Structure formats: structure tokens, C-alpha cells
Design a binder for this molecule. Structure first.
Ligand SMILES: [Mg+2]
Ligand SMILES: [Mg+2]
Lengths: 134, 136, 135, 94, 38
RNA sequence: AGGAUGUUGGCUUAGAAGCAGCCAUCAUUUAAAGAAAGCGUAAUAGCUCACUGGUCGAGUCGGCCUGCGCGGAAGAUGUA
């Protein structure tokens, strides 16, 4: 049982994916194009986390999750890299609205009972990566 | 190493160290290191204890040194007989009486001040204790 | 730990919830990971059911307030209460399939009607239909 | 509100005051107003606990001596040079 | 075994024991923490 | 018995997932669960702590003032 964060319609590479779950007994090509097959619908260049699930006979299933908060916050701030020193160096400025969108996606993935709570968590990430909410 | 910039005389009598101390309460900071013993404090011991406390609190807050080594201590060199005048000044000391507050600290939590003072007390030749500022 | 002002406040709140609700289901929940709980919480919020783990001493206290005295004896061992504040049942239902499915914990006694409900026969509540089923 | 029980001192001086502190007591004095000053004894550890609170030096205290309450304020305190002890307290009539 | 004049607990698992009039430090986790006053 | 979710926090790095280092240390679901106290891995995994529910059933925790002891304490002709 292994967890990755793989690029949408991309899979197979050796330093990225290969070795990682390859050294657990996983059929590479199968997962590659099954993963890509279902992640076709994702927007281009959204890094998506997948939980791979292998059984004693080397066969496997997997679940796709919503992209990381840090990722969506990177894209929402229009940036590429979080701050090297978050809350000492500020980078990005997502509106309360962008927070809410990201929150609803990640709401499909949160544990918040309300929009506000989820949004607060996403804000927590946004703070953690030196993005200000503006 | 603390030392008077200049003095009226170079050498002093041995004297005695009787009596209790003046300045027995924390007057500048909030925590203090009060001496319960009697003895001398050389300038090196004062500097050693200061560095131990300065590094203990990672150079934070404020630290006062309430004593100053103003008494010169002379020594005769080796293989020298008695007489032929007083020896040369080698180091400076501050006479300490029981109750003298040696160091004061401010701007740090008490639990951190105790460890800082504990590290500094290990460098001093006299027994000390932890005191805190009180309402006079 | 919990100052006396805390625990008084914990009681008060659990008691106030007890007044509004209509069907209380009590169960052991020991030996279940937090993920399966977190899952049961989304199933409680969804189904309008209030969920709390509370000290058995502390439950006895505010529970003696209204018709919740029969449950006293259900407060021996690890206790999880389920307050279906909007609609009745559904918790009683929910807990058992969740109970069966996970073969950890047990379920103790429920209570409706100001009458204690015996572990086995809870199947009564756990089969009571919807409010819009009499149409 | 702090209430203190005290006894009038029978004799003063260095020798008498040191015998008090050896007997877990300590002298004090009450002056102020037109009355004559009054020398008293106090139980040390009991007073030592009260003075550990900041309001002890701000509020008005009552000292019952010969069953008579006197409202005073802590004026000055003589502490031991290096021990957590009290040696003398000045009380001024409120 | 550390034979020193000042024996102290070096971690959470160190225990102070007095055996035959000798203060000792035994540690169920770190064998380096074994001390005895001497 | 639990010690969860965003999440492998951001940066860095071949990797850095609580646990080389730097910065931040919020928020959620919570009975409670640190953006992690220590071990562990190439990085994960895995062990454990903080914390909390349960069991038990009445004392227990840790500072001060002091009395008397313990260690620290090895020499040469022989106890000495
Ligand atoms: Mg005399
Ligand atoms: Mg011999």
C-alpha cells in the first residue's frame, strides 16, 4: 500500500514513479495508463494525489483524490513555488473567493462540517506557504 | 574582563571581608542571582559566569552585573623570597558578602532564568541562590 | 486536565442537547480508529445526529435532569452517546450496521419514550421508517 | 482582607529580638497618628505566607492585639539578607 | 559504566537506585546511561 | 484502547513524508491527538511520547524551612 502525487495525464517515469511502487510488486504500465485513463478529465498540469492499493498477488487498485492544497494555492496565486520563508517573505494573494473554490474542491476532500471550516483549513495552508490571502 | 580604567593607587592592603552585603534585592531586572556565601570574585569568574548566562538565553533580554572587581590582588613570582617590597598586581577581585546580588536578568521567562543562573552559578566559587523582584 | 468550571460547562451543554433530541442511542466505541469515527461523524452530521464521547460520571449528572435516568446503568465502560435531535431513530439504525460491519465495539442500550431499550430488541427503532412514510 | 494576631513585646534590644527570631517569631512596630508607637511580635511563617501576595502591601490590614483591631498599612519590611525570612515590619496606622 | 561523583538521570528511562550504599543510575533504554557514584 | 483530516505544510534536496537543515506552526474532525518528544527508514513504512475515553478506588504529586546521616575520600615498616 503506497501513496503518490502524480501529474494528471502523465505516468511511468523511473525517478518519479517507477522504482517507488515498482519495488513493491506493482505492474508499472497498467497503473500508468489506467491512472492516465481516469485522470484525463483533470485540468492540464494539476498534480493529483493517488493512493495505490496492492494485494499479496501483486494486483492492485487505487483511489484518486483532489489535488494538494499547496498546489491549488500555488495555481490560485499564479505562482510556481511557495515562499522559502513563509510569513517572513510573502508571495501570492488569493481572494476569499479563491480560498472558497479551493475549499470546495478540497471540500470534496476535507473533514470540515461547513464551507467556513474548510476555507479556514485552506487558509491555514495558504499561511503555511507564505501566500497572503488578499 | 572588568577592571577599573584608572586608579588612585596601584596596590591595596589585604583587608578583611566581614559583614553582610549592601544591595540585597533585585533593583533593575526581575530575577537575580544572590550570593549566600562569602569570598572573592575574580574578574575572570565574573566574565565566565556572564558568558554562561548570555549563551544560555541565546543573547536575549537584559543582563545586569551588579558587582565590579575594583580590588587589585598582588602576587610574588616563583622562586622569590619574602620581602623586597609588595608583589605586582596580577588580577582584580570583588569582595562578596552574603546577600549580595551578583547578576540580574530581565526579559525572559522564569523557568529559563533559573537554568541560565544555574549554568552561571557553576562557574562561581561561592554558593548562590535564585531570587526574584518583590514589592518593597 | 479539566477544571471544575470546564466540567460544569460540559454537563450543561450535553444536557441542553438532551432536551431537544428525541432518540438517544448509547454504545461502546473502544478499539475503533479515528478514521472510522471521522466517517461516522460525516454520517451523523448528514443524518442530523449529534455525537459525543463523554465521561460516564459526567453523563450521569446532566442525564438525571429530564427523562434520561434509565440509561444510568449504560454508563459502565467506554460510552458513546448518539442524540438524534432532528427526526427520531436513524442513529439506532446507523450504529448497528456500523456495529456489525466493524466487529469492534458492541452497542449497549438505547432509549426512547423515557424507557430504556435492551441491546437485542433495539431492532424496533432500527426499523422505524421515515416521517414522510405515512403519506 | 488580611487579619494578623500579635502580642505586645515585653522588652526590646538586639538580644531580645534575636531570641524572637529563634522562636519562629519576629518583632514589628506600629506608629502613625497621635498615639504612641506600639512594639509587637508576629508569628513569622504565618505572616511570611501573607506577604507573598502583592495586595499585602497595598490594602489595609487589621492587627488584633489584646483583642483590639487596628487598621494599618505595611510601610517598610526588613528582610533577611539571604534567607526567605522577615526580620522586621513597619506598620503605619491607616 | 560511568563512575563519577555526580550521577544524574540522563533521559526519561533512567532510574535512581541505591544498592549497598551506592547511588546508581540504571536505564532500560540506553546502556550508556548506566552510572554509579564513586 | 485511541493518538485523526488538509498534508508528503512551504522551502531545500537525489530524497527530506512529524523526526538532516531553514521558515511557518495554522485549521479541521475531535473525547483527545504537537505541522511532532525520542527511536527508526535511502525516502516511506514501523515503534513510542505528548493528549484523551475506559478500568481501578483514596490518597497521591513537588517546592520551602530545618535535624542527623550517605557518596565524593588514593601512599608508601604495622592495624595506625
Ligand atoms: Mg550580644
Ligand atoms: Mg598498610
Amino acid at each position: 500500500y503506497v501513496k503518490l502525487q502524480v501529474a494528471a495525464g502523465m505516468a511511468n517515469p523511473s525517478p518519479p514513479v517507477g522504482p517507488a511502487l515498482g519495488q513493491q510488486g506493482v505492474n508499472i504500465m497498467e497503473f500508468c495508463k489506467a491512472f492516465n485513463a481516469k485522470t484525463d478529465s483533470i485540468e492540464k498540469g494539476l498534480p493529483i494525489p493517488v493512493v495505490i492499493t496492492v494485494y499479496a498477488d501483486r494486483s492492485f487498485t487505487f483511489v484518486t483524490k483532489t489535488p494538494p492544497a499547496a498546489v491549488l494555492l500555488k495555481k490560485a496565486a499564479g505562482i510556481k513555488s511557495g515562499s522559502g520563508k513563509p510569513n517572513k517573505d510573502k508571495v501570492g494573494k488569493i481572494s476569499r473567493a479563491q480560498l472558497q473554490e479551493i475549499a470546495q474542491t478540497k471540500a470534496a476532500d476535507m473533514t470540515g462540517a461547513d464551507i467556513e471550516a474548510m476555507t479556514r483549513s485552506i487558509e491555514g495552508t495558504a499561511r503555511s506557504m507564505g501566500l497572503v490571502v488578499e | 574582563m572588568l577592571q577599573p580604567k584608572r586608579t588612585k593607587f596601584r596596590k591595596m592592603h589585604k583587608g578583611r571581608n566581614r559583614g553582610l552585603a549592601q544591595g540585597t534585592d533585585v533593583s533593575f531586572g526581575s530575577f537575580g542571582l544572590k550570593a549566600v556565601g562569602r569570598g572573592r570574585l575574580t574578574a575572570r569568574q565574573i566574565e565566565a559566569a556572564r558568558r554562561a548566562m548570555t549563551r544560555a538565553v541565546k543573547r536575549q533580554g537584559k543582563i545586569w552585573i551588579r558587582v565590579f572587581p575594583d580590588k587589585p590582588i598582588t602576587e610574588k613570582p616563583l622562586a622569590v623570597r619574602m620581602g623586597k617590597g609588595k608583589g605586582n598586581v596580577e588580577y582584580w577581585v570583588a569582595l562578596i558578602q552574603p546577600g549580595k546580588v551578583l547578576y540580574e536578568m530581565d526579559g525572559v521567562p522564569e523557568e529559563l532564568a533559573r537554568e541560565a543562573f544555574k549554568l552561571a552559578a557553576a562557574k562561581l566559587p561561592i554558593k548562590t541562590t535564585f531570587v526574584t523582584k518583590t514589592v518593597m | 486536565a479539566l477544571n471544575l468550571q470546564d466540567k460544569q460547562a460540559i454537563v450543561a451543554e450535553v444536557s441542553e442537547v438532551a432536551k431537544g433530541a428525541l432518540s438517544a442511542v448509547v454504545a461502546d466505541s473502544r478499539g475503533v480508529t479515528v478514521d472510522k469515527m471521522t466517517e461516522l461523524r460525516k454520517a451523523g452530521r448528514e443524518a442530523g445526529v449529534y455525537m459525543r464521547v463523554v465521561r460516564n460520571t459526567l453523563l450521569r449528572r446532566a442525564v438525571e435532569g429530564t427523562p434520561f435516568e434509565c440509561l444510568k446503568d449504560a454508563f459502565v465502560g467506554p460510552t458513546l452517546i448518539a442524540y438524534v435531535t432532528e427526526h427520531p431513530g436513524a442513529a439506532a439504525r446507523l450504529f448497528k450496521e456500523f456495529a456489525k460491519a466493524n466487529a469492534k465495539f458492541e452497542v449497549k442500550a438505547a432509549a426512547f419514550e423515557g424507557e430504556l431499550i435492551p441491546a437485542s430488541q433495539i431492532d424496533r427503532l432500527a426499523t422505524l421508517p421515515t416521517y414522510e412514510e405515512a403519506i | 482582607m488580611f487579619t494578623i494576631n500579635a502580642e505586645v513585646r515585653k522588652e526590646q534590644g538586639k538580644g531580645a529580638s534575636r531570641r524572637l527570631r529563634a522562636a519562629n517569631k519576629f518583632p514589628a512596630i506600629i506608629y502613625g497618628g497621635k498615639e504612641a508607637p506600639l512594639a509587637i511580635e508576629l508569628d513569622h511563617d504565618k505572616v511570611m505566607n501573607m506577604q507573598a501576595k502583592a495586595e499585602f502591601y497595598s490594602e489595609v490590614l487589621t492587627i488584633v492585639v489584646d483583642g483590639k483591631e487596628i487598621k494599618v498599612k505595611a510601610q517598610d519590611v526588613q528582610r533577611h539578607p539571604y534567607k526567605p525570612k522577615l526580620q522586621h515590619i513597619d506598620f503605619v496606622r491607616a | 559504566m560511568k563512575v563519577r561523583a555526580s550521577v544524574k538521570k540522563l533521559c526519561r528511562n533512567c532510574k535512581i537506585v541505591k544498592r549497598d550504599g551506592v547511588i546508581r543510575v540504571i536505564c532500560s533504554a540506553e546502556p550508556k546511561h548506566k552510572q554509579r557514584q564513586g
